[PDB]
């Protein structure tokens, strides 16, 4: 498994907490854009 993981860390940057939080905020911003469409149609 570790041998497979040595190729994982060659194909994939370590998923630190930083990029993880940025990706979570990206999902948050997608839903915030859907909310904007919702309330613009509701205007």
């Amino acid at each position: 498994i570790l041998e497979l993981e040595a190729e994982r860390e060659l194909l994939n940057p370590p998923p630190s907490p930083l990029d993880k939080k940025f990706e979570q905020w990206e999902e948050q911003q997608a839903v915030e854009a859907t909310l904007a469409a919702m309330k613009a149609r509701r205007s």
Partner: protein
């Protein structure tokens, strides 16, 4: 010498290229860098063997800390009702298990720095090999182009100086 003549096919083939090497380094250069690629595929697998051994040592730490938790569970069966008496022995064992766990964890701090520094050493070195391959390709092009240029100058100098003086002075005298 008869020995020399026997060796002649193998030695003189090499020497015939040896005098050529200014025109033709390509085979010796690419042979060496091929050997460097054969090494470098080892160096990457040796890095993977170090990472595997580092995290396997950490998996042994994961077991030690799991048995330490098993010692907390056995304490918890006596950590209610004020019956913590048996926790004396249970945590007395866990103290030795924590010492090995943190010995592993701090060995694994050095082994961390080893896998980081060896990864940076490799990525610098192999990127230098990549750019050196780029330079070699461009160097064989430069060399062949210079050789061609040398041939134009030398053949042009013989064409103008030898041929043209032969044309003008022999036609004029005739």
């Amino acid at each position: 010498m008869e020995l020399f003549n026997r060796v002649g096919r193998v030695l003189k083939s090499q020497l015939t290229h040896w005098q050529q090497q200014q025109e033709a380094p390509e085979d010796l250069l690419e042979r060496l860098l091929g050997e460097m690629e054969l090494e470098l595929i080892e160096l990457r697998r040796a890095l993977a063997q170090t990472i595997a051994t580092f995290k396997s040592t950490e998996r042994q730490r994961d077991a030690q800390q799991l048995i330490a938790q098993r010692w907390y569970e056995k304490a918890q069966a006596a950590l209610d009702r004020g019956n913590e008496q048996l926790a004396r022995e249970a945590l007395g064992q866990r103290q030795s298990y924590q010492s090995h766990t943190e010995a592993l964890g701090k060995s694994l701090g050095e082994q961390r720095a080893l896998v980081e520094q060896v990864r940076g050493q490799l990525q610098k070195l192999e990127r230098k090999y990549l750019e050196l391959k780029s330079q070699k390709n461009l160097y064989l092009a430069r060399l062949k182009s210079a050789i061609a240029a040398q041939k134009i100058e030398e053949i042009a100098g013989n064409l103008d100086n030898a041929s043209a003086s032969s044309l003008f002075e022999r036609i004029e005298t005739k």
